[PDB]
């Protein structure tokens, strides 16, 4: 295990914990705000995936300050994880190309 593959893996586990904590905390944040749809755990979990990937369909979104603060942490964990996989793939390819050039 090279750093880049350990980091990629670490980021995958950590993203899964953020999707779950974020589902829980969003529901807690959002109930009490009239009109809020982000208020049961199963679709909160769907919401957290859709936010973390940045698809953002808009079937669900938080309307409270704390729902929105939670949503910002999910966006950033998701963009960073997926960026940390791209960076780990780039590290693999560069090494392979060196080895091939005979370097």
């Amino acid at each position: 295990s090279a750093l880049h593959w350990r980091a990629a893996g670490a980021a995958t586990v950590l993203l899964v914990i953020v999707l779950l904590a974020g589902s829980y905390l969003a529901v807690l944040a959002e109930r009490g705000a009239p009109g809020a749809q982000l208020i049961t755990y199963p679709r909160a979990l769907w919401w957290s995936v859709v936010t973390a990937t940045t698809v953002g369909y808009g079937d669900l979104y938080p309307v409270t300050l704390w729902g929105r603060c939670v949503a910002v942490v999910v966006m950033v964990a998701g963009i960073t994880s997926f960026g940390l996989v791209t960076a780990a793939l780039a590290t693999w390819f560069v090494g392979r190309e060196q080895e091939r050039r005979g370097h």
Partner: antibody
Amino acid sequence: QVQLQQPGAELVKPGASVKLSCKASGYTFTSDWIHWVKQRPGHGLEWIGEIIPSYGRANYNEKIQKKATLTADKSSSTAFMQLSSLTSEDSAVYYCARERGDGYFAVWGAGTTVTVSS
Amino acid sequence: DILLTQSPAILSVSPGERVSFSCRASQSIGTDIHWYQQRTNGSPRLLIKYASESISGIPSRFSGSGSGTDFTLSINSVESEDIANYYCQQSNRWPFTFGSGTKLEIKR
């Protein structure tokens, strides 16, 4: 098993308060909300409010005069609703129900009949 | 806050016949509608959740249907144990709200 356990009745004097209770058993998750519903004699059900015992966070029906204050004791698996400064408009049956956070009341208490009289 | 309208308030059917209770929502709530039975001096009892999904415990006689603003609980072959008050409740938007309710009533 009986999952929610409520007292059968309380008498309360006009202007007095009372602390209703609800002892849960069976599966008691972190994810669980306890709800309180008020049924006046020959009327329908009114959602009054909800507490999550794990966090102790509570929301109320703001469409009505606020009489309730929801508290949970996580050690004794018990939800409380303090109803204060009661008139006769407040005479009713109050149920607790358990919602798993997917939006429906799976399991109800038998309810507490609260009579406000002198 | 969402408004659950249950009309009519009383429903008179003959024994063995099909009965339908209506719930209309004031704005679209998908299928986030659940139905409770309350017999004289009983607690409410979940019958249907998510509009059409069965709860085990419940006679197959009980069905539900509907999507958006129009929901229906059906009892195919009403029997005497069905005499009760039927309520709808939505979990689409905060807070949870109930219907005004519908008395079923058999003409024997």
